[PDB]
Amino acid sequence: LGLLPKPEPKVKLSNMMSVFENDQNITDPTAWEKVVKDQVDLRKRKHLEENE
RNA sequence: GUUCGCGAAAUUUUACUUCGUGGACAUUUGGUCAAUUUGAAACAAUACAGAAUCAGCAGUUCCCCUGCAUAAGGAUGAACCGUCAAAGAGAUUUGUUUU
């Protein structure tokens, strides 16, 4: 219906290589590393925040 | 009656022409492109078999690990002990080592 944003793909350090949807995958190697890692840390952050 | 093959004759061995001889000697069918053209009905145009592929996440089902919640259930540590507050009136007592 459009009331909720379309979900973006979950990216891990394993799956990191094979997701080409984002801009920076191959062309900027290290910033894409930072993107992925901060996505992971962000999910774990959501978990701990919910628990607290 | 049609052809192929062997033997004989007339001429220059194969060749034509004829005699004696061994076979072979049926026709059809199962063979239609579909789609489209206002007319006494024909196959004439008009096409003409051309009549999408790699990758990612998530979601259902079970399992393990780690959190937080909730229901129950347990184990252990924590040195010191419980039958009021204010004001007013009445009754009783009160020379030299530690100020």
PDB file of C-alpha atoms (C1' of nucleotides) in Angstrom:
ATOM      1  CA  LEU A   1       0.000   0.000   0.000  1.00  0.00           C
ATOM      2  CA  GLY A   2       2.998   2.308   0.339  1.00  0.00           C
ATOM      3  CA  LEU A   3       2.595   3.063   4.046  1.00  0.00           C
ATOM      4  CA  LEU A   4       5.868   1.347   4.979  1.00  0.00           C
ATOM      5  CA  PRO A   5       9.257   1.612   3.248  1.00  0.00           C
ATOM      6  CA  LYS A   6      10.427  -1.161   0.956  1.00  0.00           C
ATOM      7  CA  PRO A   7      12.911  -3.422   2.771  1.00  0.00           C
ATOM      8  CA  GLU A   8      16.592  -3.304   1.849  1.00  0.00           C
ATOM      9  CA  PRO A   9      18.629  -6.518   1.643  1.00  0.00           C
ATOM     10  CA  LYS A  10      20.329  -7.762   4.781  1.00  0.00           C
ATOM     11  CA  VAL A  11      24.084  -7.728   4.260  1.00  0.00           C
ATOM     12  CA  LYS A  12      26.522  -9.746   6.352  1.00  0.00           C
ATOM     13  CA  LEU A  13      30.277 -10.184   6.099  1.00  0.00           C
ATOM     14  CA  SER A  14      29.633 -13.464   4.259  1.00  0.00           C
ATOM     15  CA  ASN A  15      26.923 -12.132   1.924  1.00  0.00           C
ATOM     16  CA  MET A  16      28.947  -8.894   1.585  1.00  0.00           C
ATOM     17  CA  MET A  17      30.610 -10.011  -1.627  1.00  0.00           C
ATOM     18  CA  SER A  18      27.504 -10.998  -3.555  1.00  0.00           C
ATOM     19  CA  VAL A  19      25.206  -7.977  -3.043  1.00  0.00           C
ATOM     20  CA  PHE A  20      25.591  -5.628  -6.021  1.00  0.00           C
ATOM     21  CA  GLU A  21      22.465  -3.529  -5.462  1.00  0.00           C
ATOM     22  CA  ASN A  22      24.323  -0.841  -3.511  1.00  0.00           C
ATOM     23  CA  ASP A  23      26.682   1.667  -5.145  1.00  0.00           C
ATOM     24  CA  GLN A  24      29.985   1.128  -3.425  1.00  0.00           C
ATOM     25  CA  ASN A  25      30.519  -2.660  -3.506  1.00  0.00           C
ATOM     26  CA  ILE A  26      33.542  -3.076  -5.796  1.00  0.00           C
ATOM     27  CA  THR A  27      34.420   0.504  -6.753  1.00  0.00           C
ATOM     28  CA  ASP A  28      35.067   1.687  -3.228  1.00  0.00           C
ATOM     29  CA  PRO A  29      36.205  -1.400  -1.295  1.00  0.00           C
ATOM     30  CA  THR A  30      36.779  -0.055   2.206  1.00  0.00           C
ATOM     31  CA  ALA A  31      33.802   2.290   2.581  1.00  0.00           C
ATOM     32  CA  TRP A  32      31.589  -0.638   1.566  1.00  0.00           C
ATOM     33  CA  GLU A  33      33.247  -2.682   4.311  1.00  0.00           C
ATOM     34  CA  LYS A  34      32.369   0.110   6.737  1.00  0.00           C
ATOM     35  CA  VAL A  35      28.787   0.229   5.434  1.00  0.00           C
ATOM     36  CA  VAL A  36      28.273  -3.510   5.902  1.00  0.00           C
ATOM     37  CA  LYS A  37      29.914  -3.712   9.320  1.00  0.00           C
ATOM     38  CA  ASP A  38      27.965  -0.716  10.614  1.00  0.00           C
ATOM     39  CA  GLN A  39      24.774  -2.346   9.345  1.00  0.00           C
ATOM     40  CA  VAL A  40      25.566  -5.468  11.385  1.00  0.00           C
ATOM     41  CA  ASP A  41      26.546  -3.514  14.502  1.00  0.00           C
ATOM     42  CA  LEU A  42      23.360  -1.505  14.036  1.00  0.00           C
ATOM     43  CA  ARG A  43      21.153  -4.614  14.064  1.00  0.00           C
ATOM     44  CA  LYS A  44      22.870  -5.958  17.181  1.00  0.00           C
ATOM     45  CA  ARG A  45      22.424  -2.495  18.680  1.00  0.00           C
ATOM     46  CA  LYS A  46      18.684  -2.706  18.001  1.00  0.00           C
ATOM     47  CA  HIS A  47      18.593  -6.063  19.779  1.00  0.00           C
ATOM     48  CA  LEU A  48      20.370  -4.807  22.900  1.00  0.00           C
ATOM     49  CA  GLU A  49      18.350  -1.574  22.956  1.00  0.00           C
ATOM     50  CA  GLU A  50      15.128  -3.589  22.860  1.00  0.00           C
ATOM     51  CA  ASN A  51      16.324  -5.806  25.715  1.00  0.00           C
ATOM     52  CA  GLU A  52      17.297  -2.862  27.930  1.00  0.00           C
TER      53      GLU A  52
ATOM     54  C1'   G B   1       3.854 -56.719 -75.767  1.00  0.00           C
ATOM     55  C1'   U B   2       8.890 -53.553 -72.362  1.00  0.00           C
ATOM     56  C1'   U B   3      13.614 -53.923 -70.938  1.00  0.00           C
ATOM     57  C1'   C B   4      18.505 -56.519 -69.104  1.00  0.00           C
ATOM     58  C1'   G B   5      21.768 -61.068 -70.211  1.00  0.00           C
ATOM     59  C1'   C B   6      23.878 -65.514 -73.044  1.00  0.00           C
ATOM     60  C1'   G B   7      24.260 -68.647 -78.142  1.00  0.00           C
ATOM     61  C1'   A B   8      23.609 -68.472 -84.101  1.00  0.00           C
ATOM     62  C1'   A B   9      23.512 -65.711 -89.055  1.00  0.00           C
ATOM     63  C1'   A B  10      24.161 -61.392 -92.829  1.00  0.00           C
ATOM     64  C1'   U B  11      28.742 -57.206 -92.612  1.00  0.00           C
ATOM     65  C1'   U B  12      34.646 -54.515 -90.186  1.00  0.00           C
ATOM     66  C1'   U B  13      35.389 -58.992 -82.878  1.00  0.00           C
ATOM     67  C1'   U B  14      32.134 -54.257 -79.232  1.00  0.00           C
ATOM     68  C1'   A B  15      27.484 -52.008 -82.854  1.00  0.00           C
ATOM     69  C1'   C B  16      22.350 -52.797 -85.730  1.00  0.00           C
ATOM     70  C1'   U B  17      18.646 -56.504 -87.365  1.00  0.00           C
ATOM     71  C1'   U B  18      16.561 -61.216 -86.947  1.00  0.00           C
ATOM     72  C1'   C B  19      16.040 -66.289 -84.586  1.00  0.00           C
ATOM     73  C1'   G B  20      16.975 -69.987 -79.716  1.00  0.00           C
ATOM     74  C1'   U B  21      16.918 -68.683 -74.746  1.00  0.00           C
ATOM     75  C1'   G B  22      17.141 -66.859 -68.045  1.00  0.00           C
ATOM     76  C1'   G B  23      14.860 -63.171 -64.991  1.00  0.00           C
ATOM     77  C1'   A B  24      12.488 -58.726 -64.024  1.00  0.00           C
ATOM     78  C1'   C B  25       7.661 -57.057 -65.619  1.00  0.00           C
ATOM     79  C1'   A B  26       0.808 -52.862 -60.854  1.00  0.00           C
ATOM     80  C1'   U B  27      -2.055 -48.197 -59.630  1.00  0.00           C
ATOM     81  C1'   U B  28      -3.392 -44.979 -55.806  1.00  0.00           C
ATOM     82  C1'   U B  29      -3.931 -43.302 -50.192  1.00  0.00           C
ATOM     83  C1'   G B  30      -1.888 -42.154 -45.570  1.00  0.00           C
ATOM     84  C1'   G B  31       1.272 -35.026 -48.991  1.00  0.00           C
ATOM     85  C1'   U B  32      -4.064 -29.268 -47.036  1.00  0.00           C
ATOM     86  C1'   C B  33       0.828 -23.808 -43.355  1.00  0.00           C
ATOM     87  C1'   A B  34      -2.218 -21.279 -39.850  1.00  0.00           C
ATOM     88  C1'   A B  35      -3.837 -15.710 -39.823  1.00  0.00           C
ATOM     89  C1'   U B  36      -6.560 -11.822 -43.102  1.00  0.00           C
ATOM     90  C1'   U B  37      -9.722  -9.242 -48.170  1.00  0.00           C
ATOM     91  C1'   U B  38     -18.956  -6.198 -48.781  1.00  0.00           C
ATOM     92  C1'   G B  39     -21.062 -11.225 -52.234  1.00  0.00           C
ATOM     93  C1'   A B  40     -23.307 -14.748 -58.379  1.00  0.00           C
ATOM     94  C1'   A B  41     -17.245 -18.230 -56.478  1.00  0.00           C
ATOM     95  C1'   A B  42     -11.959 -19.107 -57.814  1.00  0.00           C
ATOM     96  C1'   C B  43      -6.783 -19.877 -55.012  1.00  0.00           C
ATOM     97  C1'   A B  44      -5.730 -14.675 -56.519  1.00  0.00           C
ATOM     98  C1'   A B  45      -3.496 -11.303 -53.214  1.00  0.00           C
ATOM     99  C1'   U B  46      -1.559 -10.091 -47.647  1.00  0.00           C
ATOM    100  C1'   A B  47       1.455 -11.724 -44.104  1.00  0.00           C
ATOM    101  C1'   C B  48       5.526 -16.186 -43.958  1.00  0.00           C
ATOM    102  C1'   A B  49       6.304 -20.006 -39.176  1.00  0.00           C
ATOM    103  C1'   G B  50      11.020 -14.303 -35.667  1.00  0.00           C
ATOM    104  C1'   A B  51       3.100 -17.391 -35.340  1.00  0.00           C
ATOM    105  C1'   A B  52      14.160 -12.741 -23.005  1.00  0.00           C
ATOM    106  C1'   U B  53      18.674 -14.099 -19.792  1.00  0.00           C
ATOM    107  C1'   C B  54      22.239 -13.691 -14.790  1.00  0.00           C
ATOM    108  C1'   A B  55      22.023 -12.282  -9.492  1.00  0.00           C
ATOM    109  C1'   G B  56      20.329 -10.679  -4.247  1.00  0.00           C
ATOM    110  C1'   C B  57      17.228 -10.521   0.225  1.00  0.00           C
ATOM    111  C1'   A B  58      13.349 -11.811   2.852  1.00  0.00           C
ATOM    112  C1'   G B  59       9.409 -15.263   4.243  1.00  0.00           C
ATOM    113  C1'   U B  60       7.214 -20.729   6.225  1.00  0.00           C
ATOM    114  C1'   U B  61       9.430 -25.646   9.149  1.00  0.00           C
ATOM    115  C1'   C B  62      12.752 -27.669  12.690  1.00  0.00           C
ATOM    116  C1'   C B  63      17.828 -27.343  15.676  1.00  0.00           C
ATOM    117  C1'   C B  64      21.726 -24.941  18.498  1.00  0.00           C
ATOM    118  C1'   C B  65      24.039 -20.582  20.845  1.00  0.00           C
ATOM    119  C1'   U B  66      23.269 -15.926  23.498  1.00  0.00           C
ATOM    120  C1'   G B  67      20.161 -12.090  25.625  1.00  0.00           C
ATOM    121  C1'   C B  68      15.568  -9.632  28.061  1.00  0.00           C
ATOM    122  C1'   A B  69      10.500 -10.474  29.716  1.00  0.00           C
ATOM    123  C1'   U B  70       7.048 -13.634  32.356  1.00  0.00           C
ATOM    124  C1'   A B  71       5.133 -17.630  35.163  1.00  0.00           C
ATOM    125  C1'   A B  72       6.421 -20.948  38.737  1.00  0.00           C
ATOM    126  C1'   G B  73      10.426 -23.079  41.639  1.00  0.00           C
ATOM    127  C1'   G B  74      15.038 -23.253  44.387  1.00  0.00           C
ATOM    128  C1'   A B  75      20.746 -22.003  46.763  1.00  0.00           C
ATOM    129  C1'   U B  76      23.676 -18.439  49.304  1.00  0.00           C
ATOM    130  C1'   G B  77      25.600 -13.987  51.359  1.00  0.00           C
ATOM    131  C1'   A B  78      24.865  -9.088  53.822  1.00  0.00           C
ATOM    132  C1'   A B  79      27.002  -7.165  62.024  1.00  0.00           C
ATOM    133  C1'   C B  80      24.028  -5.547  66.523  1.00  0.00           C
ATOM    134  C1'   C B  81      18.227  -5.810  69.051  1.00  0.00           C
ATOM    135  C1'   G B  82      10.835  -1.002  67.832  1.00  0.00           C
ATOM    136  C1'   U B  83       4.913  -1.270  73.086  1.00  0.00           C
ATOM    137  C1'   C B  84       4.918   9.751  67.876  1.00  0.00           C
ATOM    138  C1'   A B  85       5.555  15.599  66.961  1.00  0.00           C
ATOM    139  C1'   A B  86       3.839  20.686  69.014  1.00  0.00           C
ATOM    140  C1'   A B  87       1.116  23.832  72.546  1.00  0.00           C
ATOM    141  C1'   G B  88      -1.812  24.624  77.078  1.00  0.00           C
ATOM    142  C1'   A B  89      -3.650  23.491  82.445  1.00  0.00           C
ATOM    143  C1'   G B  90      -2.782  20.951  87.115  1.00  0.00           C
ATOM    144  C1'   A B  91       0.663  17.858  91.024  1.00  0.00           C
ATOM    145  C1'   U B  92       6.136  16.534  93.341  1.00  0.00           C
ATOM    146  C1'   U B  93      11.585  17.379  93.903  1.00  0.00           C
ATOM    147  C1'   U B  94      16.430  20.594  93.316  1.00  0.00           C
ATOM    148  C1'   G B  95      36.940  24.729 100.738  1.00  0.00           C
ATOM    149  C1'   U B  96      40.553  20.757  96.991  1.00  0.00           C
ATOM    150  C1'   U B  97      41.229  15.481  91.447  1.00  0.00           C
ATOM    151  C1'   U B  98      36.527  15.422  85.772  1.00  0.00           C
ATOM    152  C1'   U B  99      35.648  21.755  82.921  1.00  0.00           C
TER     153        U B  99
END
